[PDB]
Amino acid sequence: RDCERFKFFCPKCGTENIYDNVFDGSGLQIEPGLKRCSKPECDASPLDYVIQVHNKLLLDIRRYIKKYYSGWLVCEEKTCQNRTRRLPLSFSRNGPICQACSKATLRSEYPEKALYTQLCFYRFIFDWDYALEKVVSEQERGHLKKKLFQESENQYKKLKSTVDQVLSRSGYSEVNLSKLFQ
């Protein structure tokens, strides 16, 4: 609920398309989100410009990684709310001590969990199988589990491969038992 949704500008009409689920619509009118543009007057199919969708996905992933590695810290005290990029070596039991007030802890503005959840959401909005099993209903699942959508399924699998590749390089799927047991 706190994750940014996938924004893609249609190459033809230039209208923003917000993607938050694999499938859009209800009943037999349900189709993959990247099949039709959000503008009724626009006939362009975003599935045609899947190279552009891939590029925008990579740019968004870079943006989120940059946000995480910016390392912005905010004081948890409402009356201080000090915002700094510098992590001080002076720590309390709860974490870094804010050097503006010297009495409250500095919390990450964009913690690791936020980035992990963002990448997981980008995977979610392209997970055909998961959407079919969980999100989609019975009649909708039947309508979507036929031909006329195989190409869309393949493109969605390719797009999910990108987010899967990125997540495979994240330390937030591996547990280092050396760090736990010492």
Partner 1 sequence: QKYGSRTNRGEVVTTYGELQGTTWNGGSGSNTNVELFTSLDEPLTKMYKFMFQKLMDIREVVSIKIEELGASLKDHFQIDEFTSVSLPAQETVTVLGQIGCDSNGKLNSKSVILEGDREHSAGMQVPVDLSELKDYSLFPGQVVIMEGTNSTGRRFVPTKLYEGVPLPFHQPSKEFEECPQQMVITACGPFTTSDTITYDALKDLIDIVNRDRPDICILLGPFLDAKHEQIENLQLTVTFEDVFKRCLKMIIEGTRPSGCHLVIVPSLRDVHHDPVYPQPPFSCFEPAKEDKERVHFVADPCTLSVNGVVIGMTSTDLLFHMGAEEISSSDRFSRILRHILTQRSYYPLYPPNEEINIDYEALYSYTPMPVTPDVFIVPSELRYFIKDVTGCICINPGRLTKGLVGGTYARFLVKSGAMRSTCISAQVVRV
Partner 2 sequence: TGDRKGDLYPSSLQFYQHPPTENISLIEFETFAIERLKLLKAVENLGVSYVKNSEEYSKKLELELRKLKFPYRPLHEEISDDVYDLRRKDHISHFILRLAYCQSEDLRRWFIQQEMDLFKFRFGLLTKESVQEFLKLNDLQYVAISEDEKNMHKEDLMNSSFGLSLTKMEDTEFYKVPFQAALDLVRPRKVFLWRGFAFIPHKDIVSIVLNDFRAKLSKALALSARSLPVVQSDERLQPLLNHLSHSYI
Binding site residue list: 10, 13, 37, 42, 75, 80, 98, 101
Q: Which tokens is 173 given?
A: 């799927």
Q: Which tokens is 81 given?
A: 């709310």
Q: Does 93 bind partner 1 (CB under 8 A)?
A: no
Q: Does 171 bind partner 1 (CB under 8 A)?
A: yes
Q: Does 114 bind Zn ion (CB under 5 A)?
A: no
Q: Does 32 bind partner 1 (CB under 8 A)?
A: no
Point out which residues pair with 73 in neighbouring strands. 84, 108
Q: Does 150 bind partner 2 (CB under 8 A)?
A: no
Length of the chain: 182
Give the number of residues in contact with partner 2, rule: CB under 8 A: 13
The two most distant CA atoms of the chain are separated, in Å, by: 64
Among 16, 25, 43, 87, binds partner 1 (CB under 8 A): 87
Q: Does 112 bind partner 1 (CB under 8 A)?
A: yes
Q: What amino acid is encoded at 167 in this protein?
A: L
| CA distances for 96 relative to 4, 67, 76, 88, angstroms | 28, 20, 11, 6
Q: Does 148 bind partner 2 (CB under 8 A)?
A: no
Among the listed ranges 12-20, 21-29, 34-42, 60-68, the one in contact with partner 1 (CB under 8 A) is 60-68
Start-to-end CA distance of the chain, whole Å, equals 37
Give the number of residues in contact with partner 1, rule: CB under 8 A: 36
Burial readout 78-95 (b: 16 or more C-beta within 10 A, e: otherwise):
eebeeebeeeeeeeeeee
Residues that bind partner 1 (CB under 8 A): 9, 51-52, 54-56, 58-59, 62, 65-66, 68-71, 83-91, 95-96, 99, 108, 112, 115-116, 169-172, 174
